[PDB]
Amino acid sequence: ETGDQRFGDLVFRQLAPNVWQHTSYLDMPGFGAVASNGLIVRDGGRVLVVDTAWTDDQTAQILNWIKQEINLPVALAVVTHAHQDKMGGMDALHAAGIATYANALSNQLAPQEGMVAAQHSLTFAANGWVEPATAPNFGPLKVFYPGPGHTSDNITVGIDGTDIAFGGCLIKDSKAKSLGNLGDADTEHYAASARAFGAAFPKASMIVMSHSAPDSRAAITHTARMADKLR
Ligand SMILES: [Zn+2]
């Protein structure tokens, strides 16, 4: 109604009464500006964050936006995989005293990827759901590890009480021409891993993704079908 708010170098798009997409950009000569998306979730008297911005500085701006726009404390942040777009503002989260969580494997891979591990490790049961003891007080955040896909550590998040689920860098948009960068990809499991995500949040009608605008469930089926062509 007032459109998408520009704050610092960042853009915020309200997806639901309690949920916002946060967006930061990296201008890569020859590619133009590349968007990275994450979530902000107001749960009662606290805010929960999914992913960082590309950099620590942009991640500090997310925190400033929350303080100024929502004025509630940030209880915790979850990072979807170990890569710059999801994990790049870890130091800013630490400096702010925010409890950080990532897949235990993300935390294992972090040093190699040249990044800072989150404070806490999430572990997942055989059915892919996070062990509740490793994710204390996650509220509406439901964390699912679909298996190896775009990376081996990629996880995914639904928001209880909304129609939203977030597939991270695993799901591409319904018109995407390719699955993009496969260097860390497990190409034989990728398709199953996408369908697993779909089945893990069967009710979500809005799929937020890393690099593009929110899409419908078509994004999941499109991604799965492209990934079928690799196996
Ligand atoms: Zn990635």
Residue numbers in the entry: 40 to 270
Sentences from the study reporting this entry:
NDM-1 is an extended spectrum zinc dependent β-lactamase capable of hydrolyzing nearly all classes of β-lactams, impairing the ability to treat life-threatening infections with intravenously and orally available carbapenems..
The structure of mZnNDM-1 Δ36NY was obtained in the presence of 10 mM zinc chloride. All four monomers in the asymmetric unit contain zinc atoms bound to the Zn1 site (His120, His122 and His189), therefore confirming NDM-1 as a member of subclass B1 of MBLs and showing that Zn1 is a higher affinity site, as predicted for other MBLs. This zinc atom is shifted approximately 0.8 Å as compared with the di-zinc NDM-1 structure and shows somewhat longer Zn-His distances. The metal bound structure is very similar to apo structures (for example, rmsd between Cα atoms of apoNDM-1 Δ38 comparing 218 residues of chain B of mZnNDM-1 Δ36NY is 0.46 Å). Monomer C contains tightly coordinated water (H-bond distance 2.8 Å) that may correspond to the position of the catalytic water molecule involved in β-lactam hydrolysis. It seems that there are three distinct states of the NDM-1: metal free, singly metalated and doubly metalated.
